[PDB]
Design a binder for this molecule. Structure first.
Ligand SMILES: O=C(NCCO)c1ccc2c(c1)C(=O)c1ccc(Nc3cc(NC(=O)c4cccs4)c(F)cc3F)cc1CC2
Ligand SMILES: CCCCCCCCO[C@@H]1O[C@H](CO)[C@@H](O)[C@H](O)[C@H]1O
Ligand SMILES: CCCCCCCCO[C@@H]1O[C@H](CO)[C@@H](O)[C@H](O)[C@H]1O
Length: 328
């Protein structure tokens, strides 16, 4: 059992093992793991077991992180608690690789080279194939959720502000496809290529307005998957927007880029390219290796439909902390 030491950070006492030094806020903190020589990120959970909803989300997060073992997905390096028993088990800390920046801090409103864009988006997609294969969707993919290196190695965070969001999430559709994350990728890719936000809506309705201007009004196939006739009649009522030509916004882009984007930013989520399909697109020829794009082991999400007592969630979480084996 390690020896801990306490300290004030983010307006609260953090008790962590000796090995982790130089905690600096980023609630998350950067640190240096002196035992393994890694810069790491330490997340202290916000009141993990005050309520049943808190306790389940604590458990969800730990279950997800213990499962993910992929180079482009944030994985778990340690999980600890200063408590010596379940009885006094009240705090949870999760440790991961510290990447250093996010895709915002990187791009910095500048335009990236096409090669650089390929490598970044390929990594995103490679990571999404993995997580999608475990039947997990991100739901909120965006630049500040993509942690990146000085070397540009990328890892996705917080899987399972409204600029990268699929139009159906925004409209409370409720039966999401994994291609909601593909919409977000399209938004990210286009921003990397031009230096600007593709859809910088001022609010909810302006966002949907800017989308429709680019992608045009919903088609006939799409309309017949919409139940509400009032929703339908409002739509067919609007000015009839043709889909825009993807060249005009992306002038001088690799035409393979424009092709992939056309396949990603399709209103109809059923008609969007999937992560695995996108990896095999020609835009990625220089990075694509079909035998190094792995899928996940199947992930038991049977706890999601359970309604249990707070002490049950808290105990399940305690068990997973106690069974944790650091990776190699
Ligand atoms: O080094 C940095 N700042 C120093 C000041 O310049 C820095 C700046 C930005 C970023 C990181 C590091 C960085 O590497 C980083 C690392 C982890 C992180 N979030 C984070 C997220 C999670 N959990 C999750 O992502 C998931 C929960 C559920 C499924 S995934 C976690 F368990 C621990 C974490 F630390 C956010 C970030 C944010 C991006
Ligand atoms: C003005 C914006 C119109 C948005 C139309 C988005 C259509 C989203 O696509 C819909 O996604 C649903 C699940 O999310 C699927 O069940 C539907 O089959 C699919 O058509
Ligand atoms: C800017 C106004 C756009 C409104 C479009 C709303 C239509 C989405 O309505 C969605 O239709 C689905 C399939 O019929 C239903 O299952 C969902 O409950 C509903 O959210």
């Amino acid at each position: 059992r390690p020896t801990f030491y306490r300290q004030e950070l983010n307006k609260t006492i953090w008790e962590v093992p000796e090995r982790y030094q130089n905690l600096s806020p980023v609630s998350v903190c950067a640190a240096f793991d002196t035992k393994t020589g890694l810069r790491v990120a330490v997340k202290k959970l916000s009141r993990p077991f005050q309520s049943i909803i808190h306790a389940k989300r604590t458990y969800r997060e730990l279950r997800l992180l213990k499962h993910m073992k992929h180079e482009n997905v944030i994985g778990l390096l340690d999980v600890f608690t200063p408590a010596r028993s379940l009885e006094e088990f009240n705090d949870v800390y999760l440790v991961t690789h510290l990447m250093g920046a996010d895709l915002n801090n990187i791009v910095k409103c500048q335009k990236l080279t096409d090669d650089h864009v390929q490598f970044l988006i390929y990594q995103i997609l490679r990571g999404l194939k993995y997580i999608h294969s475990a039947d997990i969707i991100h739901r909120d993919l965006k630049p500040s959720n993509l942690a990146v290196n000085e070397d540009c190695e990328l890892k996705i965070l917080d899987f399972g502000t409204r600029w990268y969001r699929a139009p159906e999430i925004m409209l409370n559709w409720m039966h999401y496809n994994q291609t909601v994350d593909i919409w977000s990728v399209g938004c990210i890719m286009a921003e990397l290529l031009t230096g600007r936000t593709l859809f910088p809506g001022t609010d909810h309705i302006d966002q949907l307005k800017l989308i429709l201007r680019l992608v045009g009004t919903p088609g006939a196939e799409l309309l017949k998957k919409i139940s509400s006739e009032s929703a339908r009649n409002y739509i067919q009522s609007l000015t009839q927007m043709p889909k825009m030509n993807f060249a005009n916004v992306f002038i001088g882009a690799n035409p393979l880029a424009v092709d992939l984007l056309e396949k990603m930013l399709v209103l109809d989520s059923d008609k969007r390219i999937t992560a695995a399909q996108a990896l095999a697109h020609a835009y990625f020829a220089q990075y694509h290796d079909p035998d190094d794009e792995p899928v996940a082991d199947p992930y038991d999400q049977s706890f999601e439909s359970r309604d249990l007592l707070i002490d049950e969630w808290k105990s399940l979480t305690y068990d997973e902390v106690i069974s944790f084996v650091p990776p190699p």
